[PDB]
Every structure is written in structure tokens, then in C-alpha cells.
Amino acid sequence: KVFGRCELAAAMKRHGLDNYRGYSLGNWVCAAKFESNFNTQATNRNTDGSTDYGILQINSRWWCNDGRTPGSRNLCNIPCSALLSSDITASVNCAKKIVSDGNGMNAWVAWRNRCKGTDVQAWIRGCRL
Ligand SMILES: [Cl-]
Ligand SMILES: [Cl-]
């Protein structure tokens, strides 16, 4: 599923991401835009052989099991394919674990390089929330 901007903002708000660990809703929408272009089916292969999955591009090296990343962890206790569903619950629940691990949203390279230090509130402007 390819979300609209305000549609995704409302879905993330309902799932408790607004101000989660101090990150306002616009940060999460901005991260999803640049990680996946709002597409739940996005996948991308990394150089080390791991793969990033879903709207927030969660990495199989640490967070999910895809059966093809030897020596990796599965810290969210899910198959990586669950991160590609049109229902974002699994992605959001795993993202809450990632952002709590000490490095905040810096775990998302596109957030650090394209959202951090910008007017992220623009990403929710005009939305009924
Ligand atoms: Cl915001
Ligand atoms: Cl933080």
C-alpha cells in the first residue's frame, strides 16, 4: 500500500508515535517519506547482505528474521515479511523498540540526513488529526 501523507500521519498517531520518546509526529512522517516513499512494500538490499523492509526500512541484521541474513538477530521477534503489510502495526511496534535502544531516530539514516534539524512539522501541516 502507498499511503498518503495525512493518511499515514493519522495512522501513526493512532498507534502512539506522536511524541514517542520525544519525537513529534512530523519526524516519523518525514522518515517514512525518505525511507520508503510511503510504500509499505519497499525493500532494499544492503552491502553486508541484510535487507531493509517496509515503510520504515527496518533492517534484518538486527530486527527481523528473513531466513537469509546469517548471524543476524531478530530483536522484534517477527518475520521481516510482516513489515510489508498494509497494516502498519508491526512496523510501528518494532520502530518503538528501535528508537528506545539509545540512539533515538539516528538509527534511520534518511532521518539523520534529511529530517533532523528541519521544520518537520511541515509534514503534518494541513492534516486533520
Ligand atoms: Cl511535528
Ligand atoms: Cl533521543
If phi over 0 gives left and psi between -120 and 50 gives alpha, with beta otherwise, what is residue 126?
left
Enclosing domain of residue 31: 1-129
Determine contact, residues 23/105, Cβ cutoff 8 Å.
yes
CB burial of 25-38 (b: ≥16 within 10 Å; e: otherwise) equals bbbbbbbbbbbbeb
Of the candidates 52, 66, 87, 119, the residue annotated as catalytic is: 52
Determine contact, residues 51/40, Cβ cutoff 8 Å.
no
CATH number reported for the structural domain that contains residue 69 in this entry = 1.10.530.10
Query: Structural domain tally of the chain?
Result: 1
* Resolution of this deposited model, Å: 1.5
Q: How was this structure determined?
A: X-ray
Residue 65 CA: distances (Å) to CA of 6, 62, 69? 30, 8, 8
Type of residue at 36: S
Residue 80 CA: distances (Å) to CA of 104, 106, 121? 21, 21, 30
The alpha helices in the chain, defined as continuous H runs, are: 5-14, 25-36, 89-99, 109-114
Distance 25 CA to ligand 1 centre (A): 5
Cell 488529526 -> residue: 129
66 is in an annotated binding site: no
CA atoms of 42 and 56, how far apart (whole Å): 9
